[PDB]
Structures are given as structure tokens and as C-alpha cells.
Design an enzyme around this catalytic site. Structure first.
Site, PDB file in Angstrom:
ATOM      1  N   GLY A   1       1.053   5.423  17.676  1.00 52.97           N
ATOM      2  CA  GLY A   1       1.115   6.477  18.664  1.00 52.97           C
ATOM      3  C   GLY A   1       1.597   6.050  20.035  1.00 52.97           C
TER       4      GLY A   1
ATOM      5  N   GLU B   1      -6.238  -4.290  10.549  1.00 57.36           N
ATOM      6  CA  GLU B   1      -5.393  -3.152  10.886  1.00 57.36           C
ATOM      7  C   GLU B   1      -5.426  -2.901  12.387  1.00 57.36           C
ATOM      8  OE1 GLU B   1      -7.178  -0.409   7.666  1.00 57.36           O
ATOM      9  OE2 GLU B   1      -5.193   0.434   8.069  1.00 57.36           O
TER      10      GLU B   1
ATOM     11  N   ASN C   1       0.863  -1.181   0.000  1.00 54.72           N
ATOM     12  CA  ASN C   1       0.000   0.000   0.000  1.00 54.72           C
ATOM     13  C   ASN C   1       0.898   1.228   0.000  1.00 54.72           C
ATOM     14  OD1 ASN C   1      -1.964   1.943   0.211  1.00 54.72           O
ATOM     15  ND2 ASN C   1      -2.550   1.438   2.317  1.00 54.72           N
TER      16      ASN C   1
ATOM     17  N   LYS D   1       0.094   4.163  -0.417  1.00 52.08           N
ATOM     18  CA  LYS D   1      -0.672   5.299   0.105  1.00 52.08           C
ATOM     19  C   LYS D   1      -0.486   6.493  -0.836  1.00 52.08           C
ATOM     20  CE  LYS D   1      -0.578   3.512   4.829  1.00 52.08           C
ATOM     21  NZ  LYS D   1      -0.502   3.893   6.273  1.00 52.08           N
TER      22      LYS D   1
ATOM     23  N   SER E   1       2.297  -2.485  11.560  1.00 50.26           N
ATOM     24  CA  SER E   1       3.665  -2.118  11.202  1.00 50.26           C
ATOM     25  C   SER E   1       4.453  -3.382  10.875  1.00 50.26           C
ATOM     26  CB  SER E   1       4.325  -1.341  12.339  1.00 50.26           C
ATOM     27  OG  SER E   1       3.528  -0.237  12.729  1.00 50.26           O
TER      28      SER E   1
ATOM     29  N   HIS F   1      -9.823   1.131   4.039  1.00 48.76           N
ATOM     30  CA  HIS F   1      -8.631   1.382   4.832  1.00 48.76           C
ATOM     31  C   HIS F   1      -8.941   2.343   5.972  1.00 48.76           C
ATOM     32  CE1 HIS F   1      -4.600   2.709   5.958  1.00 48.76           C
ATOM     33  NE2 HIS F   1      -4.158   1.608   5.376  1.00 48.76           N
TER      34      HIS F   1
ATOM     35  N   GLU G   1      -7.533   4.785   7.159  1.00 46.46           N
ATOM     36  CA  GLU G   1      -7.366   6.206   6.868  1.00 46.46           C
ATOM     37  C   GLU G   1      -8.613   6.786   6.211  1.00 46.46           C
ATOM     38  OE1 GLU G   1      -3.684   5.790   4.781  1.00 46.46           O
ATOM     39  OE2 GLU G   1      -2.668   5.409   6.683  1.00 46.46           O
TER      40      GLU G   1
END
Ligand code: NA
Ligand code: NA
Ligand code: NA
Ligand code: NA
Lengths: 249, 249
Positions: B172, B166, B10, B12, B212, B94, B96
Site C-alpha cells: 500500500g 511477511e 503460494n 493463493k 514482494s 498467512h 491474509e
């Protein structure tokens, strides 16, 4: 007198490889002997082929949208990616993105500012809905929209700005906007730009009509005092877009 | 035997012509001697050059988003346009786009169903946030998201469906999601598909890890019962993606 006119083809979310290649060659075939900037805004997918097939010297290629910066924004396209791709024109704030895809006045304004800062020529779209016009808020909405954009720019940035007025209020009704109604909104916009930005900017600014236009009424719309061309929807996917180009004299 | 793994890149909202050309040729150079489907999801703008330049037989190209139908949707790309363009894989839902671009469970589900009905292989993304996992709502959220998709599909449609989990909650914080946390979420999904759609469907379904992933942890993540590959973010723009491919052997 009028600055250089613009004939912009907003293909929206449309096109196939074969049908666009043929429309592209139709545009290539056209003899355009007066000073006009023609613009083809294809989908992101078709930008490569439009760059490759479109050879008419009076045409440039545009995007229909972007976000300001590259990064973790799956599905979106950024200004740096378009710039690296050789695309220097962009349509921003179209009524369809304001209605469907969350683009408030502020979101449009920040995109326009980022695009000008990146060297783009920008066709920034404004216009009021039917409920807004019938409630007497045409001037409120339209001048709020452009002030939101203006507050994020500097006076010299307007050399890279084009305004497209969309009479959104005319959709679904039984009557397209009249040339007098179009001229009325354009004159309001230019009056505002002269008063708030500068008469010099107002004289050089292109304000494009963004309603429904065809080869029969385009000449009359362009005859209006404050109309500097067209940001064309459905007719821009058809041969009559050539007649719209010719209507800019 | 696990079903055929998938290594999905991906990209992005990233890429330039030169840097993607070199990355594509690195992908082209890789020797892959096991059964795996590699997928490159580029921006809309780069689909053409990826189609032209990616020649590795184990690779296919994907879009990162689409809307269901062509029409008056300025800035968007539709499934028919992508199909006409020869793009047969697509990433939908996704995190996002769920967070930034208004994609509810329903909107994601309708896109997935339209893409399956149009012949696409669909990597459908689900996953819970930090606040949701802290609230003890991981199972509630993930199973709500997949049920929203499943109810718009028929059993045979799942041959064209891939699920990407995901772990949005992991971004964070200072703690990487462990391989066991990934496996437990995949097992939850797998168990749900078994009960609600069918054990046959659950056995064939590819559930990709979309956290990740890098060349150092990819093998540990893949060597778990219910992990069938990866939907890779930042490492997919790097030569490290080759090691992620090798980790699916
Ligand atoms: Na052409
Ligand atoms: Na051509
Ligand atoms: Na006339
Ligand atoms: Na006239």
C-alpha cells in the site's frame, strides 16, 4: 404438487481416498428410477476424485463453501475456480460456517448472490439455534436469514436457489426434531417466499430438511407437505444414504 | 553454510486447470543443479492435478491452510485428509488468514502444533502491519507471534518448522521494503530462536522472506545472512518464479 426433490450428501470435513472411492461406487451401484437430483458435496480436496469416480447419471458434485472472487485470499477457494473445475452446485451458509467461520447473514447473502450470478445451483442454508428457538425467535431468525439473502437476488434468480432448513436447535438435546416441527418450519419458509417473492417461485422452490435423518425416518419426513428432500450430514457418509434417496419416492 | 533454501510458490486463491498445467510444465522444465526445496502451495481444489502433473524431483506440494481434525466443519479441510492425500507440506498463519479469517496468534499456533504432530513440514507465517511498524511495535508483534507458536512446540519439533517473515507493512505504500529491512527482521527472528530455543535450532532454521519477491530483486534478498529463501505471492504464478529459484543458488 412438489417440484423435483433433492437428496444432498454433505460429507463435511471427512473422507479418505479409499473409503470415499468405495462409498462412491456404492452410490454408483444404486438403481434410482424416479426423478430426483442427487448431490455429493465433498471437501475441496476430494472434488477431483469425486468428479472421476461418480458416474451415476442422477448425481452431481457440489462444493461446501467458496468466496466470490479469486485473488489474495490464502487458503480459500473462489467461485471462478470451482466453475473452471466443472463444479456447478454449492452449499452456502451452513450453520457450521455461520457459527465458526464468521458468516453473518450478509456474508452468506453476498456469497449466494455471487454464486447465482456465476451460474451455480445454490443450496443456501438457514436455521435457528436452541437459544433462539427457546426464546421464541424461530420465525424472527429464519425469516431474517432468508430476507438477507432475498434482498440481494432478483425474482428470476430463485430458479437457481434451493433452501435447506437446519434445525440447529435439536443438536445436543435428547430429541431430534419431529416431522411436525420440520413441516412447521418448512411451511413458514414457503409461506414467506410466496408472500415476498411470488407464489410461482414458492411452488417451484425446493426446501430441504437439514436435520438428522436416517433410513427409518426419512420416508416420514419426506411425506410432509413442504419437504422437498434432504441435506444430509453424517448419514451421507454411510450406506443408509441410499435409503434416504429412496425416501424421496 | 546456510541450511537448505526453500522456494515456496503460494498460488493463493488463483488458477485454472489449463493455466496451472502450463505453469507446472514450466516448473517441470527447469534445470536446478543446487540443493533447494521447491514448494507449490495450490488451492485445495488443484492439489490433485498438481500431484499428478508436477514431476520435478526438487518439488513438493503444499496446502495453504487446514484445520486440525476431521468432523462437522463444513467447507474446511483437515490435516488427516491432507495426509491421506499425500500432501506433507502446509502453509499456516498467512497474514491474509490472520486478517480476514480470524486466525489469532493462538489459532495459528494450535494449527502449527497439530501439523507438526501429524508429520507435516510447516511454513509458519509471522509479520507486522504498517500501523504496528509505525507504532515502533515490529519487535513486539513478531516476537509475540513466534512465542505463541514456540510455546506449543518442543525443541525437536523445529526440525519440521519453517518461518516465513511477511512485511505486511510494505503493501500500500510507494516504498519497497529494502533488502536490509528484510535482513534485520530475519536477524531478529534468528536471534530470538537462538536465545529461547537453542543456537543449534537457530542455525538449522529456514527463515523465508514473504514480501514482494520477483526475478529482479530475489538474488539481492537471498544474499543476506539470515534469508533462506522465499514464500512468493504473485510472481509464483508467473515464469519469473524460475528466476526466484535460481536466486537461491
Ligand atoms: Na469411486
Ligand atoms: Na474409482
Ligand atoms: Na410415515
Ligand atoms: Na408419510
Amino acid at each position: 404438487s412438489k417440484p423435483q426433490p433433492i437428496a444432498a450428501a454433505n460429507w463435511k470435513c471427512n473422507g479418505s481416498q479409499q473409503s470415499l472411492s468405495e462409498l462412491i461406487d456404492l452410490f454408483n451401484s444404486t438403481s434410482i428410477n424416479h426423478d430426483v437430483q442427487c448431490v455429493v458435496a465433498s471437501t475441496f480436496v476430494h472434488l477431483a476424485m469425486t468428479k472421476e469416480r461418480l458416474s451415476h447419471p442422477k448425481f452431481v458434485i457440489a462444493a461446501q463453501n467458496a468466496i466470490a472472487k479469486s485473488g489474495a485470499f490464502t487458503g480459500e477457494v473462489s467461485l471462478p475456480i470451482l466453475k473452471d473445475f466443472g463444479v456447478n452446485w454449492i452449499v452456502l451458509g451452513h450453520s457450521e460456517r455461520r457459527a465458526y467461520y464468521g458468516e453473518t447473514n450478509e456474508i452468506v447473502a453476498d456469497k449466494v448472490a455471487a454464486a447465482v450470478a456465476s451460474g451455480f445451483m445454490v443450496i443456501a442454508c438457514i436455521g435457528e439455534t436452541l437459544q433462539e428457538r427457546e426464546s421464541g425467535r424461530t420465525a424472527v431468525v429464519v425469516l431474517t436469514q432468508i430476507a438477507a439473502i432475498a434482498k440481494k437476488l432478483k425474482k428470476a434468480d430463485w430458479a437457481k436457489v434451493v433452501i435447506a432448513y437446519e434445525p440447529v436447535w435439536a443438536i445436543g438435546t435428547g430429541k431430534v426434531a419431529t416431522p411436525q416441527q420440520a413441516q412447521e418450519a418448512h411451511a413458514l419458509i414457503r409461506s414467506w417466499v410466496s408472500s415476498k417473492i411470488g407464489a410461482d417461485v414458492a411452488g417451484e422452490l425446493r426446501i430441504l430438511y437439514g436435520g438428522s435423518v436416517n433410513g427409518k425416518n426419512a420416508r416420514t419426513l419426506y411425506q410432509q407437505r413442504d419437504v422437498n428432500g434432504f441435506a444430509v450430514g453424517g448419514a451421507s457418509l454411510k450406506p443408509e444414504f441410499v435409503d434416504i434417496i429412496k425416501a424421496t419416492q
